[PDB]
């Protein structure tokens, strides 16, 4: 009916403006995020250099460098969004996380979940696997105070052995504005 179609052209003509605005806001924020990545990079390089020098002098008997006697459990940290509209970003993270689970349970470790973001906390609220701890309010603007708490909680869960024999992180690696993928890294041991 023409009245319906006129309304739908009015609707779609509003949405085209609101999505074109958020394409341009996301085009601002990728530049700010790349600035904060390249500002956090020189510290990460110098802490790696300092840690290489200390490991050169050390006996290396620090717990985070050694395998547990029985592979009882594994931690997975999954990093994901609070905002929607991100597209396949969370689909890719959550698919790579479920693939990591298949490999871990193939070795015999059951995963235990730590989650950053509200979308993955929704996904693991629908699929009946528990989350041990979560964080939500900062995925678009993470601050070191947040990563301090996450890394403390992960290291406490590794050193507790109610504890994990290894732990991993699943997140998307930014490699260009046109190319990113979900990746899985073992952070400990």
């Amino acid at each position: 009916t023409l009245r319906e179609l006129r309304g739908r052209i009015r609707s779609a003509g509003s949405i085209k403006k609101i999505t074109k605005a958020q394409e341009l806001i996301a085009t601002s924020r990728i530049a700010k995020a790349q600035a904060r990545v390249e500002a956090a990079r020189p510290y990460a390089a110098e802490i790696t250099n300092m840690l290489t020098e200390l490991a050169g002098a050390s006996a290396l008997d620090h717990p985070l460098l050694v395998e547990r006697k029985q592979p009882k459990r594994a931690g997975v940290l999954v990093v994901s969004s609070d905002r929607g509209l991100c597209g396949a970003y969370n689909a890719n993270v959550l698919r790579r996380a479920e693939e990591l689970f298949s490999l871990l349970r193939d070795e015999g470790k059951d995963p235990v979940l730590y989650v950053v973001g509200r979308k993955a906390l929704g996904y693991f609220s629908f699929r009946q696997r528990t989350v041990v701890e979560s964080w939500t309010g900062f995925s678009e603007r993470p601050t070191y105070e947040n990563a301090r708490e996450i890394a403390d909680t992960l290291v406490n869960a590794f050193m507790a052995g109610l504890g994990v024999d290894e732990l991993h992180i699943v997140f998307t690696e930014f490699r260009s504005m046109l190319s990113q993928t979900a990746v899985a890294r073992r952070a400990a041991p």
Binding site: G87, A88, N92, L178, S179, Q180, T181
Partner: protein
């Protein structure tokens, strides 16, 4: 008994003739199409329709699996293979070879910026020597086993003889 729906979006992008597959079809055709053409083109309609959907999807994805990416790059080279200039009707003995190049994957070493020139030089080379391929197709309607091996022995000699406008020689 069918339609060749010419899409103005494809025509403005420069795909000419602008045959919009899936919505274009022939419902009598396939009975009358000569056996060699029917052997080479027997999947090409389906391979182009699945390319149009796969591209309309993947143009807004960061990355995809290697089998899908191979199907996409094949499809984009088949689209560059099918276009041709006005008032240049090809004889069927030249059409079936031009579609053999693309469907059998011999274009997979050639970049999308050179593919139309690659077919244009190859179809003159095979018109100048090895012409028993074109003559055989014309006089028996069939791309026989002994014409197929004699074609693949010539396409590889031409691929080493060819150089893209950017990148290396082909293989």
């Amino acid at each position: 008994d069918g339609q060749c729906f010419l899409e103005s979006d494809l025509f403005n992008q420069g795909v000419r003739p602008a045959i919009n597959v899936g919505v274009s079809v022939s419902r009598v055709g396939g009975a009358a199409q000569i056996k060699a053409m029917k052997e080479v083109a027997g999947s090409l309609r389906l391979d182009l329709s699945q390319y149009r959907e796969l591209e309309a999807f993947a143009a807004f994805a960061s990355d995809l699996d290697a089998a899908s990416k191979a199907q996409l790059d094949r499809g984009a080279r088949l689209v560059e293979l099918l276009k041709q200039p006005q008032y240049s009707p090809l004889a069927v003995e030249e059409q079936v070879v031009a579609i053999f190049l693309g469907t059998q994957g011999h274009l997979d070493s050639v970049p999308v910026e050179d593919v139309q020139r690659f077919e244009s030089e190859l179809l003159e080379h095979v018109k100048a020597s090895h012409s028993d391929i074109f003559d055989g197709i014309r006089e028996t309607k069939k791309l026989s086993e002994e014409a197929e091996e004699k074609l693949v022995s010539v396409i590889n000699e031409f691929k080493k003889g060819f150089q893209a406008s950017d990148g290396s020689s082909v293989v």
